[PDB]
Amino acid sequence: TTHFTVADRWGNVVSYTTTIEQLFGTGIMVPDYGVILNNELTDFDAIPGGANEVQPNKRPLSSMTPTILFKDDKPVLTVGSPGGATIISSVLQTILYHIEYGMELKAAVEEPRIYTNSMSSYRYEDGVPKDVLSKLNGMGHKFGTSPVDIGNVQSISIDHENGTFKGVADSSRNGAAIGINLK
């Protein structure tokens, strides 16, 4: 998965998450045509009967969360990320740090993240304090012994008062933000 975002001088705003599922998808390339094929259908439940069971012509449940935030009826922030089920958590945390904690956008994006979907599945990024992890594990959590990167948030902020845009790429990949100043 990858997430990108664009905003233009006419007020159009795009927030676009897009994927082939696993890195390199199935690994299968259409011979003579160079196209790598998704494994997206493994996003269905393997055991049928539930909401996300496989059915013909059905779409497998996604976690992609391209998002646009508005203030006073104008778009002011775009957020999104890759990372499977962790996406929802990366988008959540970016919004929390920028809005609830009032952090500058790059700082909000770089704030160490955590993710946990169950009692047996935990991830944390470098910078989550060791003493905190110890404390939480003491209470019943199951954080592991090593950090991992979680997500890759690209984000644009729009200042309608001053007529400016700010773009941010997450350090977890080699992304680039490029502003436009015409003429």
Partner: protein, 359 residues
């Protein structure tokens, strides 16, 4: 050199690859709009970040239209082929095929939507043709570019999977993974893009490519046919909206779980006034973790494609349901058996599916 933070007066691009950002920026500089640029960027990422996305996959493209003031999602999520079956990922004993092997099977391949999504985006908002916007990516595919560290790492990490298919000839030339700085050349992809430039999306959804894709999926054990490709269309989805800290948030509905659970987690956490706790306090992480457990449990129980299943969105986001879930969270102890709630307490109807434990 490229920056991870920039400012501009007349627009902005942010992507995971500098060559894609450059292409998007160039489109804006030359008078294109954000949709034009986004389409060019998707083709560029297909070439430069080939492990992460492209015309072999699907996505969700949220667009705010500056003229109409409407927000729309082009939903190019893949479809299961007509020959898919509920038990297709199970062995003869009815247990799941191990995940690492499951993802390599032809049964895993959804009918790709990305290209159809790009076509739809240009039809609705484009001011540049697909011929113009695909051209920079034809050139990157034909002529090559030096690979970055993330791509180099990916080729190394997934070498085994790549070695078993025609992908080996592109990423593992002479049996060895390309390294950072090595030139990646994708002649066959360039050709496919040239076919799309000449013939339009029928180059992909019909004709020899559709036959070849289908045959390949079948060779690897899947059921996809040419008819599945001919039948494919995107869906236009309406964003779900939430209020949070004075902002209105537009996000993605089913068939994504993202929007519902982003909103649910924000609504649960809003009660706790997180900023009262230091940004790296154990308290903050405790509240995040406990909230995640509740919301991911609901996701596993209740989320799927709304063309097929009754997702209880109303109940899951009902303020009284949110309150009940908030009340399950304590600072000083952990829920050791977190479970889905009963959102049907707060809305009409019932599930047309069961609760089925998964490996």
């Amino acid at each position: 050199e490229y920056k991870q933070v920039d400012v501009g007066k007349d627009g902005m691009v942010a992507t995971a690859h500098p060559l894609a950002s450059e292409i998007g920026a160039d489109v804006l500089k030359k008078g294109g709009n954000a949709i034009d640029a986004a389409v060019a960027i998707q083709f560029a990422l297909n070439v430069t970040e080939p492990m992460m996305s492209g015309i072999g996959g699907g996505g969700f493209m949220m667009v705010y239209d500056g003229k109409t003031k409407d927000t729309t999602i082009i939903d190019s999520r893949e479809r299961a082929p007509a020959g898919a079956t509920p038990d297709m990922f199970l062995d003869e004993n009815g247990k799941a095929i191990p995940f690492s092997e499951r993802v390599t099977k032809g049964t895993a391949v959804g009918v790709p939507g990305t290209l159809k999504g790009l076509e739809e985006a240009l039809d609705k908002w484009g001011t540049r043709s697909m011929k113009q916007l695909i051209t920079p990516s034809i050139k990157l595919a034909e002529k090559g570019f030096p690979i970055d560290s993330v791509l180099a790492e990916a080729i190394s990490d997934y070498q085994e999977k790549l070695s078993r298919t025609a992908a080996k000839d592109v990423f593992l030339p002479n049996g060895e993974p390309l390294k950072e700085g090595d030139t990646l050349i994708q002649k066959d992809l360039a050709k496919t893009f040239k076919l799309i430039r000449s013939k339009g999306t029928d180059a992909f959804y019909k004709g020899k490519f559709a036959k070849t894709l289908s045959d390949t999926v079948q060779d690897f054990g899947g059921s996809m046919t040419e008819k599945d490709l001919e039948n494919y269309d995107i869906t236009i989805d309406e964003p779900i909206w939430g209020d949070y800290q004075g902002y209105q948030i537009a996000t993605t509905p089913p068939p994504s779980s993202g929007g519902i659970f982003l909103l649910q987690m924000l609504k649960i956490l809003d009660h706790f006034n997180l900023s009262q706790y230091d940004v790296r306090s154990w308290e903050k992480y405790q509240l995040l973790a406990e909230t995640m457990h509740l919301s991911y449990a609901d996701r596993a129980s209740y989320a799927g494609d709304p063309e097929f299943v009754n997702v209880p969105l109303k109940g899951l986001l009902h303020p009284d349901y949110i309150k009940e879930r908030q009340q399950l969270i304590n600072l000083d102890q952990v829920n050791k058996k977190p479970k889905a709630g009963d959102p049907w307490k707060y809305q009409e109807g019932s599930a047309n599916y069961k609760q089925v434990e998964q490996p």
